[PDB]
Amino acid sequence: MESLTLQPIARVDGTINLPGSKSVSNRALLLAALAHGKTVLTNLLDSDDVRHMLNALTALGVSYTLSADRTRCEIIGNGGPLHAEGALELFLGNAGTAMRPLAAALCLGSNDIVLTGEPRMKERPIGHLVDALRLGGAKITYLEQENYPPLRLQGGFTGGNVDVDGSVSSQFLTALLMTAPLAPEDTVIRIKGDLVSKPYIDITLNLMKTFGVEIENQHYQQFVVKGGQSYQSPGTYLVEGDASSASYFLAAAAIKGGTVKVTGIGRNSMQGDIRFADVLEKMGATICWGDDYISCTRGELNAIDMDMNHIPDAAMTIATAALFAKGTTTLRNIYNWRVKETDRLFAMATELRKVGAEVEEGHDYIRITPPEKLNFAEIATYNDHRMAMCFSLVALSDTPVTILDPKCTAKTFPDYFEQLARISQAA
Numbered sequence: 001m002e003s004l005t006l007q008p009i010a011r012v013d014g015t016i017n018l019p020g021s022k023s024v025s026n027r028a029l030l031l032a033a034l035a036h037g038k039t040v041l042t043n044l045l046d047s048d049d050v051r052h053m054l055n056a057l058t059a060l061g062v063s064y065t066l067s068a069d070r071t072r073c074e075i076i077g078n079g080g081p082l083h084a085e086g087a088l089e090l091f092l093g094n095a096g097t098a099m100r101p102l103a104a105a106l107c108l109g110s111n112d113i114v115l116t117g118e119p120r121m122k123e124r125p126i127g128h129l130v131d132a133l134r135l136g137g138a139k140i141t142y143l144e145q146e147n148y149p150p151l152r153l154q155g156g157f158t159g160g161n162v163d164v165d166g167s168v169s170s171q172f173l174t175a176l177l178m179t180a181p182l183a184p185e186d187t188v189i190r191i192k193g194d195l196v197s198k199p200y201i202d203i204t205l206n207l208m209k210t211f212g213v214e215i216e217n218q219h220y221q222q223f224v225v226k227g228g229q230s231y232q233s234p235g236t237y238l239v240e241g242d243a244s245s246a247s248y249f250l251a252a253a254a255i256k257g258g259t260v261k262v263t264g265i266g267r268n269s270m271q272g273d274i275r276f277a278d279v280l281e282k283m284g285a286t287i288c289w290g291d292d293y294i295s296c297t298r299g300e301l302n303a304i305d306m307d308m309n310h311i312p313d314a315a316m317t318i319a320t321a322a323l324f325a326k327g328t329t330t331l332r333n334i335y336n337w338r339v340k341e342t343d344r345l346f347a348m349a350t351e352l353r354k355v356g357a358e359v360e361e362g363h364d365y366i367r368i369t370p371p372e373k374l375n376f377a378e379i380a381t382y383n384d385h386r387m388a389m390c391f392s393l394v395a396l397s398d399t400p401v402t403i404l405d406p407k408c409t410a411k412t413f414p415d416y417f418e419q420l421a422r423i424s425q426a427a
């Protein structure tokens with residue numbers, strides 16, 4: 001078992017040029033592969049989730065080149081649905097942004113492809129997406145547990161009236177939205193009830209429009225899609241810096257700054273996680289917005305009680321920042337933390353208690369009362385990049401912290417610790 005120990009950080013200050021957005025990167029790669037023409041993506045993220053999408057495209061026969069640092073990608077579009085037969089197996093790690101979108105896209109036309117991944121991915125739900133794709137004509141078989149990968153996709157999605165449950169993941173709707181335009185018949189996607197992680201649907205529609213397709217959004221309750229469309233290369237496309245990766249650095253300044261500026265995202269960004277800065281401001285930090293940066297300067301840090309359904313990923317960063325805040329913090333409406341890289345409500349509560357906090361693990365919320373002083377702990381990371389990144393913030397105190405399996409940050413941010421060290425100051 002590998003581990004890294006972080007020494008106490010006296011102050012943070014500086015500038016970080018963010019790695020690319022995982023959410024934007026994987027949508028842009030799949031749409032570029034489906035499109036007609038050559039797309040050049042710049043500021044693409046090099047991380048495990050993106051590498052699994054790149055490997056899947058390679059296996060499906062898509063041609064592309066990558067720059068030395070893997071952040072520039074020139075993709076030759078396929079000019080239509082991707083195909084493979086012989087139950088070709090695509091291994092997708094634990095990347096939901098590859099698994100869910102490919103599960104839908106590869107239902108176009110005929111195919112015989114198996115999608116699988118790491119053990120945890122075989123425990124992450126996908127039944128709501130499979131149910132919707134089958135209503136549209138797709139033939140899909142669960143090869144192991146019903147409602148979970150691995151899946152054998154045999155094609156057949158033609159369109160029509162499709163209901164989809166949006167209560168567990170917005171990714172099922174995202175996957176349907178990206179796929180339906182290329183189906184032969186028009187599709188009407190009806191949301192059954194609640195829709196979680198709503199801002200990610202806006203990212204999907206933004207990327208689809210960049211690739212030449214628009215649909216009719218009826219107040220996020222129903223989406224009307226015309227079939228028989230084609231995606232078209234946008235030419236050169238700049239992937240935004242990752243706003244979820246930014247959260248650690250902005251929070252570090254709110255706790256121990258100094259001023260920390262992150263570049264690559266700004267006031268015009270499409271990612272919902274830029275709203276994480278609004279939470280730091282509500283807690284007492286100062287935020288500055290630019291066209292291509294967001295900065296945070298230390299002010300004070302008071303506890304908050306907020307529904308975080310709009311920023312589920314960056315919300316984990318508030319759970320460890322809460323260790324430094326005055327009062328009890330409560331993060332609500334975050335049930336799907338349970339069905340992601342690990343059950344995050346259980347993991348976050350367990351590790352927070354190890355450093356001294358009193359924590360109530362609610363069914364779909366977490367309440368955190370900080371200790372007077374933190375103690376040393378060896379933090380388990382649950383094969384979850386964000387558990388490693390969130391607990392790195394414990395070192396902005398008088399105590400070191402040991403993080404187990406630090407390389408798990410590679411799911412979205414391989415260079416995380418070197419970047420945190422870049423803004424760590426001794427004086």
Ligand SMILES: O=C(O)C1=C[C@@H](OP(=O)(O)O)[C@@H](O)[C@H](O)C1
Nearest residue numbers: 023097168169170171197200313
């Ligand atoms: O569509 C996307 O890019 C994502 C949507 C979210 O998942 P849910 O919709 O399941 O919350 C988020 O947690 C994930 O990291 C990225």
Ligand SMILES: O=C(O)C[NH2+]CP(=O)(O)O
Nearest residue numbers: 094095096097313340386
């Ligand atoms: O990045 C995160 O915090 C959660 N990702 C879930 P996935 O992208 O694998 O569906």
